[PDB]
Amino acid sequence: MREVISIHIGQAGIQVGNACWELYCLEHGIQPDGQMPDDAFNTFFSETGAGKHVPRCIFLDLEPTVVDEVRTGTYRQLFHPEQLISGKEDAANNFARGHYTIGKEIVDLALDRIRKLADNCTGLQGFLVFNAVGGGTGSGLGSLLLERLSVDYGKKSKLGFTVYPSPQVSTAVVEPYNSVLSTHSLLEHTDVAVMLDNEAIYDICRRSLDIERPTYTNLNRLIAQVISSLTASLRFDGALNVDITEFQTNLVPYPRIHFMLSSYAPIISAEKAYHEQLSVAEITNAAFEPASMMVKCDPRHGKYMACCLMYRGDVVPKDVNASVATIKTKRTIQFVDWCPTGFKCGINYQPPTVVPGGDLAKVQRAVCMISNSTAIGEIFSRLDHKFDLMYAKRAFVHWYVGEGMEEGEFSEAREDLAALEKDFEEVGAES
Amino acid sequence: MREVISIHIGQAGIQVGNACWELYCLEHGIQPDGQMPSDKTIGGGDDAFNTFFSETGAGKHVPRCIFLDLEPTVVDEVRTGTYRQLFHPEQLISGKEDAANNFARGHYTIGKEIVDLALDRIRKLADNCTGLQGFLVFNAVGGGTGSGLGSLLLERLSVDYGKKSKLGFTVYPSPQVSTAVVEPYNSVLSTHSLLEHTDVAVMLDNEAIYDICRRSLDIERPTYTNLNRLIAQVISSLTASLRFDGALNVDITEFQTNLVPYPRIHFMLSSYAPIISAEKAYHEQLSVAEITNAAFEPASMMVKCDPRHGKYMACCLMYRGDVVPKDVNASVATIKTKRTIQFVDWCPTGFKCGINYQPPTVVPGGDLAKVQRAVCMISNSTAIGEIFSRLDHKFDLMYAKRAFVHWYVGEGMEEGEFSEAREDLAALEKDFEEVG
Amino acid sequence: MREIVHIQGGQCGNQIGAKFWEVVSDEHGIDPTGTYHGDSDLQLERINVYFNEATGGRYVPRAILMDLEPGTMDSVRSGPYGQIFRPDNFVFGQTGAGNNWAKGHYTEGAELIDSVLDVVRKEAESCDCLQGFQVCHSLGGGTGSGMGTLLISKIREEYPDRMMLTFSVVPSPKVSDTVVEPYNATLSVHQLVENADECMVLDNEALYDICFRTLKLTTPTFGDLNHLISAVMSGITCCLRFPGQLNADLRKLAVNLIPFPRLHFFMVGFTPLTSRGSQQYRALTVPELTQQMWDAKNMMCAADPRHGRYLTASALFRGRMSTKEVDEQMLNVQNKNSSYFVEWIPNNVKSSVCDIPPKGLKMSATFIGNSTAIQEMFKRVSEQFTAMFRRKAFLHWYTGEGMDEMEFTEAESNMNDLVSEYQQYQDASAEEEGEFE
Amino acid sequence: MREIVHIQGGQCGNQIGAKFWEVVSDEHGIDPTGTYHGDSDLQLERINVYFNEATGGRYVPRAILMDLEPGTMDSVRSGPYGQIFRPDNFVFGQTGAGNNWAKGHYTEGAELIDSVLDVVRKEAESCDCLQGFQVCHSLGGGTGSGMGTLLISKIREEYPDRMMLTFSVVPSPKVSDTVVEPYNATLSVHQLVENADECMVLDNEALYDICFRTLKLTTPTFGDLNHLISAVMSGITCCLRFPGQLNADLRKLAVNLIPFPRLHFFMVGFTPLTSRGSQQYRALTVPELTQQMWDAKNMMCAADPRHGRYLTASALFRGRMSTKEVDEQMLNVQNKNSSYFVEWIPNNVKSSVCDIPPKGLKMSATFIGNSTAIQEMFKRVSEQFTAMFRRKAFLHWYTGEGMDEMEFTEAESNMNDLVSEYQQYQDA
Amino acid sequence: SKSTLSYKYPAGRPNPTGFLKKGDGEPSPPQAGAYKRRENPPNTAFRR
Ligand SMILES: CC(=O)O[C@H]1C(=O)[C@@]2(C)[C@H]([C@H](OC(=O)c3ccccc3)[C@]3(O)C[C@H](OC(=O)[C@H](O)[C@@H](NC(=O)c4ccccc4)c4ccccc4)C(C)=C1C3(C)C)[C@]1(OC(C)=O)CO[C@@H]1C[C@@H]2O
Ligand SMILES: Nc1nc2c(ncn2[C@@H]2O[C@H](COP(=O)(O)OP(=O)(O)OP(=O)(O)O)[C@@H](O)[C@H]2O)c(=O)[nH]1
């Protein structure tokens, strides 16, 4: 009855889906060969006639080079091969290729597969969309998929975890274009968006886990931990259960402002765990610490508008309340005036799980804080300034105009982003 | 008690004869020796083989079929293949010369001297029967042996039995793909002759089965040996109620009255589901609901006719495996609610359902996968009159120049019999219009 | 005394007949071998109503099985309770009926009736005081309709005094198991109105919901629906078999039910009906039985009582209970919902009760209602019949057995005559003045 | 006679009801198997105020559990005392609530009333003499607040003469468990001013105070707070369930309490409460019960009665005791600190007593106060509402269900008039 | 209604326009066309 659908688009989408599913199988005792040696797996899986638990996910991409690694790996008995969707040619880091030229041939089969996947569902909670803004496939194809999903379902709730184009560390040069294009396209259709940045998670892995050379898999382990914490209350008991609609309602104040930060605590090494105590007050202080933000935004350049917290393990509601009251009394935390309230808290009795050969440490308390602050104006300003600096000269524009676009799409997107940053300015201004 | 006589004519007739009789012998445990293993008996029922076999004085089971052909080169294969201990050699029939893709030779010149032989074989093959449900004619409309002799046979069957029921699973010439050039002629020449004699005729195409093999089974190298396996699956699901138990049994007679509204409209389509490989098979559940949706899809048809351009006059659904009557009753009602699937006003009904407890069998080394649910749909749609119009065109395209006619008139025909058969089609086509 | 001979028609009636004889046999505690192994003497008091004593102290049912295509009789012969039937009471034909009323009533019918009647008489003399007959039908196929009505007419002229029941299954409103269904349905009704004395109509649809909502079942099989039908079939004759402080024969259930000789189509329902879960908690009282029964869902027929008005009704309780409670209960319903009950009848419910409850329960009730909403069934059927007979579809079969065209129009006119009878008495007040104003 | 039908709406209600039926059932010595295993014949006499006989001597409660997203019911249906309920008294919708008062009241709630009402009636008629209803709420979320009130207005009109209680848990002043809390609060209050006879208010925060200031607990869990709420809820129906030399029916408790039809908000407190170390020193007499209950700490709501004045009050003592001490004690209080009691009501306390204390104690009490400090809950909620409703924040979620705007102001004006009624009668 | 043994009309679904405000102090069967004149179209055979 408590069922969700997961969509991993682009390369980073499936790169993090692999981690999420290695997490879920291990957490629920599911062997890699589908079956295990109720109501606990039914959130992510489906039971066939005998024992087999096939996951209710979809891996969508345009490069065969990664879906075939998945098909040949140990996690090949899991998926219905019709879920792993690949294309002959890729989008080549081009929003126009991803949106107008290539993705419109496989949207039909992606949608009918989503239909067949949601048919067996009894009570559908919402769509998780793991996307990576900055690469043509990810950006354009997710925009197209979200428009189709909004016209099909509409009433359903879409969370989008979008690996966002980073300030300085960047493996691309054209991404300031497709980031603006993807935002202007999906803004009207996603129900909530969680931003997170490779630089911020690199800094976290550096300062906390003492790892100095993370090969894109530690970041995925961290994202898997985050989603497990976020969706615990769907498949695990505990006081103050919280689901997707409760999550989005008390967090998205206006139709425009739906982008939000993220954090996690504690996040430590197997020795600092053994040599620390990690009480709930320390955990919440570390969560609200700026240096724990999974995105490259400094919340002290703004004011919070709401926060959501999901405590796990040995946590008591009085301690949660006392720590939230201490945070309120603190002086370095600001709040926009029109929210005297501001915290949606939930508890789960299930501590966070650890993976064999992982890098985190076994703990008994953990917090995944998710706040909607008016400081992401700074990242929107960064992205707009970069798009500006480039489009002042019509750089790279011939690719986008040859692959089935025209010029007006750049102006629409830039004016939408200007309006969005003016929103983030005004709705925070106080009388 | 409930016995049928299976006749295979031409090449494709006895090509699928190698496929159906591969199945039945396998489905009842009969090894190619015609014996039962007699040590690991799996047959849940006794005298069920009686529908297709005849236990001899001791131990052996001989199939009640008749392989008939003019070319020796293919029945000479059966006499050397592994399935040579099964058939009584008197059943396998061959001729010295071939009809050679000529209706006149298959019907007038050569056929007239071996029907007496074949008819006497049927006579002795029906005497040992107690209750004969009806014959089962396998044909391939488009050749000389299949159409010429096949038509000449049915007339000899009608004047003898008449009250008996005849069925025709005639393969039909494809619109685009065609392994011949004169098949528009000898196809038309066949229908006008079989029509007044066959009691119901299931049609299916070589081309539509290629795509089912391409989309669902995802085979890149299909062959006649891959198609012939499918036809085995249909007739296995069709005659299951004859040789198996299950709620809502369906006999041939009960199958024929409530599916043919007018004496000449009996050309019906077919479909089967699920059609999947071993990989997809087990990451699924195959609900009764999703199976009966693929059954009514235009892609799962075995004829290159689009049912969405016409309306359904009736439908028959032979389920197979573990199916409960509520799901058929609940999933059929889902379809009547759809808007793509039309039904002519004069049938507020339109479904003759059927259930069997015996799941479909799989051939080892096959291409299909083992399942527990299967649906073979048999519908009588009025859109089938389109494929009858293509041949009305191609026949008219070449009969203008009178190409290839000197063969037919050279082998004991007259030009009259060409416009003869043409009448019956343009007459038949409007019959598909009158019901609209 | 009060013997009852049983017939089983078609494939359906031959299949629910296998279930009915599995219920009564276990009700009287006899085994699939046919030897009595119950406890009380009550099981033996009125065993002759259904069974014949045999040598060695065995009890063989007084049933008859008639069906073309003998393959199905090879099934009931193989069931758990198959070995109790006298194999000489197995009249079958090697041919098939073909879902064709004509040959099931004209050609292949006439070839067995000389044999079947020789069986029916053979065990009519075995009875000292015959109460009546009872048949099982399925108005869809050819055997249940053709051979069935052809049999009844043979019985009606040779046993006019005795009474004939009919547990005919009727077509479904939304789904059709056959395609010539509205042809076989009407051609039979023209035979049930004259030659039947009672006829309970039952539908596969309303059974699927009872098994779905009430019983909370997931996958009802025919082994379950036929378990329901077999229940009420036993719920009728409980007065004949077991004692009661207010007995109800079959004849005294008819005189109190059909005011006019043509309105003998009833509508049944069983109580109680609960799942295994709620059974832990439900207290069984006459109130619980009398609310469930009067509901519009429990009617195993697909006819909504809200579209009509109850001419009469009935209630066959069983179990040690208080005979006042049942008497005032049925009085309340007649007073609350007085608008759904005709007024030219002062009281229109007969309340019976038996001292012996079912084998596993403590109280149970069975409902029969003679409503004016049944006309909905005959509207729908008469509509489909005139949608295809207007075009003469599927008709070249029926003429194949020497029928003609008038015998179709008569069949439909004989329905529109019937459906008017329901409309007249559904809107006729006690005064002859309010109708024409 | 005097039967009671009980509702549990929302996640909070479905979890307070867990401990409640665990407390009451043990009080009558019935097992999670539903079978009676007590000793005295006193338990059997008034068992029918909450339960119904069943085959084999089982006793199922007269409860109704309703909730969107039945996930939380899967918990209690799996707990120790989860096997007592009838499975037909489990109403739920496949979708979720979303902490949104609108869809919990307009869209989704409406699709469940057709089923809920068949549930409440079928077990309101099994009562030979119905006394009243009682519900357990939470003014924060959507299911408890939204579906709760929508259920009431259906009940208020179907059974207008019977009595309806609401043990509604209200929001907390300093830490809010939800952000949309003030919107959901008032829109529910606007229903309780007109469709409620009595309404006890509770706060999870003041419950924490009593939990480690008096009980001196270490790791309080919601399972322990519900062991408090279930103690006062059980403390009301003692006079219905157990004999006493001065009984007090539920109806007579209201007429002695609310002078005007609108002031039906109370505040409760339980007594005695001691640590595991204090039971060694403190004695259990009536003068102890009467000071811990009259103190301004046992008030389970976050409202200090010293900032207002008592209109009336009550007390439900339990245990064989001297009925003079109770009379002169509650008299002595009103005389000593006369500044906190109104004047145009000379004797503004009611005192009952039951011969049957709690299962494990020898004396106990229970308190109900109708003070004018209850307006403090309404001032604090009024501002938190206007601070964000004047800006139109989080509001597009409410108009999504076709809700109007005056439904917000009317819900607010109704409050800002109720906050003045509590001040006229407070002449300070 | 299983509780009253009566056919009663269903209650009214709420409606946002009809919300409560400050002040609050407070089945015959469908007859069959027995005597209804049927429709007599002019499609007889004599006219034709
Ligand atoms: C432990 C216990 O009491 O279990 C019950 C039971 O819980 C319920 C749910 C039974 C049960 O019935 C079903 O679950 C059921 C399933 C499919 C179709 C029909 C019924 C029961 O099977 C049915 C069975 O009824 C009988 O035994 C009657 O004597 C019945 N017997 C048969 O139908 C029968 C079954 C097998 C072989 C031969 C006969 C009967 C009915 C009419 C006339 C004579 C006898 C009983 C009381 C029970 C079970 C076992 C669960 C119910 O059925 C009957 C007929 O009473 C379903 O609703 C009732 C209420 C019962 O309480
Ligand atoms: N956290 C994380 N980020 C990744 C990973 N792989 C790639 N990224 C980032 O995703 C962005 C590129 O997205 P891609 O999916 O590779 O590009 P695309 O959407 O497939 O478009 P095409 O390359 O044209 O097919 C880059 O900024 C990467 O830094 C990963 O494994 N983990």
Ligand SMILES: Nc1nc2c(ncn2[C@@H]2O[C@H](COP(=O)(O)OP(=O)(O)OP(=O)(O)O)[C@@H](O)[C@H]2O)c(=O)[nH]1
């Ligand atoms: N599905 C299927 N079709 C076949 C097969 N073999 C031949 N056909 C088709 O049948 C048609 C040819 O019919 P034949 O049987 O070869 O001709 P004939 O009836 O024997 O008469 P002659 O050619 O004179 O011997 C062609 O259209 C073939 O595509 C087969 O094995 N399976």
Ligand SMILES: Nc1nc2c(ncn2[C@@H]2O[C@H](COP(=O)(O)OP(=O)(O)O)[C@@H](O)[C@H]2O)c(=O)[nH]1
């Ligand atoms: N409840 C129930 N109905 C059945 C069963 N079997 C068949 N029916 C109905 O019987 C009808 C078919 O009539 P049938 O008796 O098989 O054909 P006949 O032999 O010519 O009388 C169909 O409408 C089926 O729905 C069964 O086992 N249980």
Ligand SMILES: Nc1nc2c(ncn2[C@@H]2O[C@H](COP(=O)(O)OP(=O)(O)O)[C@@H](O)[C@H]2O)c(=O)[nH]1
């Ligand atoms: N005493 C107690 N209060 C709770 C509990 N759980 C939640 N509450 C309160 O209930 C409020 C949230 O309302 P909720 O029940 O989750 O939303 P609903 O499902 O729409 O009713 C919060 O203010 C919680 O503090 C509990 O377990 N015990």
Ligand SMILES: [Mg+2]
């Ligand atoms: Mg890429």
Ligand SMILES: [Mg+2]
């Ligand atoms: Mg050939």
